[PDB]
Structures are given as structure tokens and as C-alpha cells.
Design an enzyme around this catalytic site. Structure first.
Site, PDB file in Angstrom:
ATOM      1  N   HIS A   6      -3.591   7.481   5.872  1.00  0.00           N
ATOM      2  CA  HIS A   6      -3.613   6.206   5.173  1.00  0.00           C
ATOM      3  C   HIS A   6      -5.064   5.755   5.369  1.00  0.00           C
ATOM      4  CE1 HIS A   6      -2.432   2.239   3.825  1.00  0.00           C
ATOM      5  NE2 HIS A   6      -2.864   1.692   4.946  1.00  0.00           N
ATOM      6  N   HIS A  49      -9.666   1.759  -0.854  1.00  0.00           N
ATOM      7  CA  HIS A  49      -8.210   1.689  -0.799  1.00  0.00           C
ATOM      8  C   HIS A  49      -7.650   1.003  -2.035  1.00  0.00           C
ATOM      9  CE1 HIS A  49      -4.229   1.571   0.718  1.00  0.00           C
ATOM     10  NE2 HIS A  49      -4.210   0.267   0.924  1.00  0.00           N
ATOM     11  N   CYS A 104       0.773  -1.230   0.000  1.00  0.00           N
ATOM     12  CA  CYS A 104       0.000   0.000   0.000  1.00  0.00           C
ATOM     13  C   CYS A 104       0.813   1.293   0.000  1.00  0.00           C
ATOM     14  CB  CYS A 104      -0.966  -0.025   1.176  1.00  0.00           C
ATOM     15  SG  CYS A 104      -1.938  -1.549   1.189  1.00  0.00           S
TER      16      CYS A 104
HETATM   17  N   LIG Z   1      -2.650   9.171   2.191  1.00  0.00           N
HETATM   18  N   LIG Z   2      -5.322   4.728   1.658  1.00  0.00           N
END
Ligand SMILES: [N+]
Ligand SMILES: [N+]
Ligand SMILES: [N+]
Ligand SMILES: [N+]
EC number: 2.3.1.41
Lengths: 406, 406
Positions: free
Chosen positions: B298, B333, B163
Site C-alpha cells: 500500500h 496515491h 483507498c
Molecule cells: N498495492
Molecule cells: N497505494
């Protein structure tokens, strides 16, 4: 800027499970290629590979290995070797913001990606998949699976660039040190060996298929009868360290990385343009006041690739071309692991003063004429060595390593 | 001490196929999450995703797209946008050794890796696999498939870090410029959306599964009832350029990258330690004396992860915590593409002076008390923004961007 050296190495390849075994194989020109029933059973035309002859069972803690694919396992074992070989202990490299890890694979883990899909499509679905597939199939599996158990606190990621993967990892580690961001960076990579991934290369006709009866002769870089590379698996890891830091702890320095080239062809997707390789080698040689004594070519034993690189070499060195040998003829092409493994073979040649033979050259290609392609183990006091790595997508990497002093 | 700025951006995300569409979605707090019959039919528990609402058929030359997987397609389209946005003509960035490309994906292409294995096991074998699976499945597919058609001659490789992938790509691009090796580097990434990869995350219980009936409410970062992230796909690309070079050609500058942090947890394989994130943000803030006006977390809407990051933010800023919003609540995401897409969302907020809302917070988590989590679009003159990206393997990336004067 800061000077960078290699203070430790570790390797698990088709020709040896450690640097001692690898050294022995290189000196003997021993082939690590064997017949693969797995590849044959899958329906492939290529039935040979450079497999790792090692039973990894129980070599890694159960709680750690459960998240790992073979690429990670190979890299992990290589890192354990490199750590010991560098003389580093946990108190020195663990939980240290100044110590990082840059290592990757060319294809992550096709095997577990397929395993996940196969299991998911079965009657058990998610329960059959299990909670460990992501870390195994993940493109950054190699870095994630090593940085975590080794308690790395510095840089942590993978660089992917096909056949140049681990070469760029080493180059990037060098950059981290030159930028003063890290004192030590473990760099390298790993690549699993499986039909799941190998069939993709066979499908594009990139693999050798005419020598399945004589495996050790399948990989024959520069031989007029070459017919594709022999896929291989394994791992490699080198300890990239800032010069002063290495000298301060009295580390064993194999060589200094005096050159690193990284370029792009911007031409063909699966074929080298040669032009990119020329710029890559020149970039790695810029500032190097010493001549290249040995060059470990990419030479994967491909009809066009082999010659294209030689043409680039002739363009760069002209009449002053260095001794050249393609270790891939012995080891096969480990894709993502090739960069670090070949950098290691070169370091072993530099360290032990010898040039590994470019085997299986029964008939030198006409386009490898006025070049010094070593076909026999030759003892020689090498000082500066170069290793080329070229991957699909026209990505090029070149590393130049030279002895320090005394 | 080369200064680095962003002079162009391109994006293909669940909330827009270009920066204008994305800008509108961000200001309206519009969700890009939809119900996925594909995920449901695959046997997954999570039936929602942030899909790219676009038919890419015919958008890319046949001879070019034949080598590409969705991650590369999304990145390619994003790059086209970024090039146009940066006002770069072909003769300005093509066949230029000073122009590079660093872009990757989190998992390459599980779909084509599985396709290859499936085809291989069928009655056609290698013939069904075809010669294009390698470039689609390899981890460096995104960089390889773009550097070649865009005639990139400089650096060319992919950074892979789950990620954090595209965030590290941007940071690495910055480093190349600071090293004086490149004048311009296209940085970003892409991620395909498919059950092949998604089921792996569902199998570890990382995806939301309790809100399939109300897809737009599934991603709810910081909400007390969050139950995992919503997987998304897409791409993003930014033109990272040396300041003088950008000014010389009169380019439009979104912001200067004044901070880049990259660290490792060296702790858990699938859970953040928080300690690494603290160091990452602190590293990105070194020398940045302006306050962070907005922080794009995040915040993927995971139970542990959401609060772990908030704790790290508290530790870093203390009683000076910045305005925070998790765009993932709207977009889902996108794994490897998240870094660049979120940097782009942050750049749009910076450029247009507003803070995108952190949506779906019906009940703020008790551990988020005392923080400035923005839940409504707020117009504000932002100057410095921060975006965090954390990936499995304890890999962390942080980018700090600041508007240039007048
Ligand atoms: N971010
Ligand atoms: N994210
Ligand atoms: N090689
Ligand atoms: N090499």
C-alpha cells in the site's frame, strides 16, 4: 449453499426512530413528509422532505461521532438498534473475523464536502476545514464510521448504487454468508438530508414541487398527479446471519432471504428500461417455490418510473401479480437508505402480518389498471415478500424474504 | 469452485495513459508527480500531485460524458482499453446478463458536489446547477456512468472503501464469478484529482508538504524523511473472467486471482492497526502454496502507515518475506483507483518479468531493516504476486495473482 436469515433490524426514518414507531406509522398510513424551510431557503422548487425527527445530540460518543456525517449517524443508531434487536453482545460480534459490515450511502456527504470547500476557501483554510472532513465526506463513510467503533473484524466496505445502495448491501452480505466467509454481516446504509444534495435532484426535475403547500400529499406513488419523488433521509441496518448460526444461539428470525437479484439496464442513465427490472425480479424469484404475497415497489412517485416498474411487474407475474404498495408515498425516497428501510418495512409487514397502504392515490394512473395496489392497511398472513430498488445508472436490486417455519 | 482470471486491463495513471506507457515508467522508475498550481492556489500546504497527463476532451461521446465526473471519465477510458485488450467485441459483452461491472471511487466527485452547492447559491440557482450533477456527484458515479454506455446487463454497482475501493471491486468481481453469477465482470475504479478533495487530506496532515520544491521526491515510501502521501488521480479497469470462459474464446490470460482478502481493523478511523492487514494477507494466502515473489505494498509514504504495513508483512511471512516495492513512490496515491492501478502494475511486472523499484529511498527507515525492499528495477521471473490496499475506517483488501502454466 448456506441459508441466510435476518435476525435483527434497526431503523431511523421519516416515519419512526425505531421499528416500533415505524410499525405504528405503516399501520396508520402516516406520512413522514414535512415542509422544509431549509430547502426553500436554498432556492429549490421542492420544499418538502422526509426528515428524521430525532435529536441525535449526545446519542453517540463524542470521540466517535466527530468523524461522522448524518448518513453515518443514522446508520450507527440503526446498527445499535439492530444489535440489541438481534440479541447480540460485544463478546459475540466484536473483534470477530466472522462478523462483517456492508453499509453505504448514495452520495456520501455533500454537506461536509461543501463544508470542507467552503471552509478551505475562507481566511482560515486548512484550520477551518479540520481533520475530520475526509471520514465525513468519504463515499465509504457509513461503513468506515460503523465498522471502527463497533470493532468489526470481518468484511468492511460500502456498496454504492444510488437508490439501490442498501439493497445491494444486503444482497452482498447474503453472498458473504453463502460463500461461507462470514457468519454475520450487518448490512444497510444511511443518507443525510440536506439542500446541498437535494438541489442536485431538483435541478434535474426529479423532485415534487407542486405540493409544497400540502407536504403529506407530495409523495403520491401511482397517483395520476404525481410530479416527482420527495427526498428523504435516514438509516437502516439488518443483521444478516447464517441460518445454523442463528438457530444455534436461539436468535429471533424475521425471515430468510431466499432471493436476491442484481442487474443492470445498460440503457438510460436516469430512466429505468424496465427490461432490467424484469430480469432482476426473476433472478430474485428463481428457486422460490412460494408465490410473492406482497411487493414493496420502488415506486418513488415519479411520472415515468412508477409506471415502468408496474409494467415490469406485469411482465414477471402476468395475471398472478402480488399485492403492491409503495411505502415511499408515506416515507419519501431516502435514496441510499431506501433499500434497507424498505426491506425493513417489508419485514415488519411480514412479521406483523399486514400490508402497508399506498397512500395519496386520489386518482389511480391508467397504467396501474389490472394490479392489486393496496391503498388501505390490510391484515393478511404474508409468507413471502419482495422489495425492489432501482437507482440511476440503471442499477437494479431485488430482495425476496420469506418466513422460516412454524 | 470456479477459477477466475484477468484477461484484460486498462489504465489512466500519473505514469501512463495505457499499459505500454505505464510499463515504460515502471521499468524506468519514472515519477508521475508534478507541482500543482491548483493545490497551491487553493491554500493547501501540499503542492504536488500525481496528475493524469491527458486531455480527455472529445474522447467520450458527448451524450455520455455529460453525465460523468473525472473519476468516471478515467474509469471509462480504462474500460475501453481493457475491453480492447481482452479482445471483447460488443456482441460478446454487451446486453449480456452474464457480464457485469463493479467499479467505484473513494470520494465520488467532491468537485461536482461543491459545484452544485456553489451554483445553487448563485443568482441562477437550479438553472446553474444543471441536470447532470447527480450522476457526477453520487458515490456510484463510476459504475453508473460505465454500465449504461457499455450496455452492461449483469451486476452493476460500486464498492466504496476509501483507498481499498478498487481492490474490493476486483475481489467482489471474483466472488460474483465464484458464485457462478457472472462469466465476466469489469472491475476497477477511478478518482478525480482536485483541491476540493485534496484539501480534506491536507487538513488532517496526511499529505506530503516538505518537498513541494522537488515534486518527484515528495512520495518516498520507506524513506526516513517521508512526510505524507502525494495525492493522485486516474483510473483502472481489469476484465475479471471465469477461467473456462476465457480459455474457450482464446483470451490472453495475465494471471489467475488465487487469493482475495478483505478484513476490518475495528480500531482506528484514520490509522492502520496492522492486525487487520495481517489477517487480510493471510486470508488472501489461504490455499496459495506458491511463494509470493513480489508484493506491491500500500506504502503511500506515510510515517505510521508505511511501517505498520511492513510489520504486518513480517508477521505474515516471517523469515520468508517477499521482494517489496511501493509503486506509490513513483505514482502518488490515487485513493479509490489505487487498488486496480496497483494490481495492474503488479500484473505488468508479472507479465514482463521485472520488479519495479521503490524509489526515493535516500535513507531506509530503521523499521524496514531486514526486508527485501527493491530500489532498482530488477528483471526476475515472477510467478505469484500480492498487492495490498488499506483505507480509512480500517478497511483492508489484498489480492494475490498467479501466472497460469506454459
Ligand atoms: N498495492
Ligand atoms: N497505494
Ligand atoms: N423507494
Ligand atoms: N422497495
Amino acid at each position: 449453499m448456506k441459508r441466510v436469515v435476518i435476525t435483527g433490524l434497526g431503523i431511523v426514518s421519516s416515519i419512526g426512530n425505531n421499528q416500533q414507531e415505524v410499525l405504528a406509522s405503516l399501520r396508520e398510513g402516516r406520512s413522514g413528509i414535512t415542509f422544509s424551510q431549509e430547502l426553500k431557503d436554498s432556492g429549490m422548487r421542492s420544499h418538502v422532505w422526509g426528515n428524521v425527527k430525532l435529536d441525535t445530540t449526545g446519542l453517540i460518543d463524542r470521540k466517535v461521532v466527530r468523524f461522522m456525517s448524518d448518513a453515518s449517524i443514522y446508520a450507527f443508531l440503526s446498527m445499535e438498534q439492530a444489535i440489541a434487536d438481534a440479541g447480540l453482545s460485544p463478546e459475540a460480534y466484536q473483534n470477530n473475523p466472522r462478523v462483517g459490515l456492508i453499509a453505504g450511502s448514495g452520495g456520501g456527504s455533500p454537506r461536509f464536502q461543501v463544508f470542507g470547500a467552503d471552509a478551505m476557501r475562507g481566511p482560515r483554510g486548512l484550520k477551518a476545514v479540520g481533520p475530520y472532513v475526509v471520514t465525513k465526506a468519504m463515499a465509504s463513510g457509513v461503513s468506515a464510521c460503523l465498522a471502527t467503533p463497533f470493532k468489526i473484524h470481518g468484511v468492511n466496505y460500502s456498496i454504492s448504487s444510488a437508490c439501490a445502495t442498501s439493497a445491494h448491501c444486503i444482497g452482498n452480505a447474503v453472498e458473504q454468508i453463502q460463500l461461507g466467509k462470514q457468519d454475520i454481516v450487518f448490512a444497510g446504509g444511511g443518507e443525510e438530508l440536506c439542500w446541498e444534495m437535494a438541489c442536485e435532484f431538483d435541478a434535474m426535475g426529479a423532485l415534487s414541487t407542486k405540493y409544497n403547500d400540502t407536504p403529506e400529499k407530495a409523495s403520491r406513488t401511482y397517483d395520476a398527479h404525481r410530479d416527482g419523488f420527495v427526498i428523504a433521509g435516514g438509516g437502516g441496518m439488518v443483521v444478516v446471519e447464517e441460518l445454523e448460526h442463528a438457530l444455534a444461539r436461539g436468535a429471533h428470525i424475521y425471515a430468510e432471504i431466499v432471493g436476491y437479484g442484481a442487474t443492470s439496464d445498460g440503457a438510460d442513465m436516469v430512466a429505468p428500461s424496465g427490461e432490467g427490472a424484469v430480469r432482476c425480479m426473476k433472478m430474485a424469484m428463481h428457486g422460490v417455490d412460494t408465490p410473492i404475497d406482497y411487493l414493496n415497489s420502488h415506486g418513488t412517485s415519479t411520472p415515468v418510473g412508477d409506471v415502468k416498474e408496474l409494467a415490469a411487474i406485469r411482465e414477471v407475474f402476468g395475471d398472478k401479480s402480488p399485492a403492491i404498495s409503495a411505502t415511499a408515498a408515506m416515507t419519501g425516497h431516502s435514496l441510499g437508505a431506501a433499500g434497507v428501510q424498505e426491506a425493513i418495512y417489508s419485514l415488519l409487514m411480514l412479521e406483523h402480518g399486514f400490508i402497508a397502504p399506498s397512500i395519496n392515490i386520489e386518482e389511480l394512473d391508467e397504467q396501474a389498471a389490472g394490479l392489486n395496489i393496496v391503498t388501505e392497511t390490510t391484515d393478511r398472513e404474508l409468507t413471502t415478500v419482495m422489495s425492489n430498488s432501482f437507482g440511476f445508472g440503471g442499477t437494479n436490486a431485488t430482495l425476496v424474504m420469506r418466513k422460516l417455519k412454524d
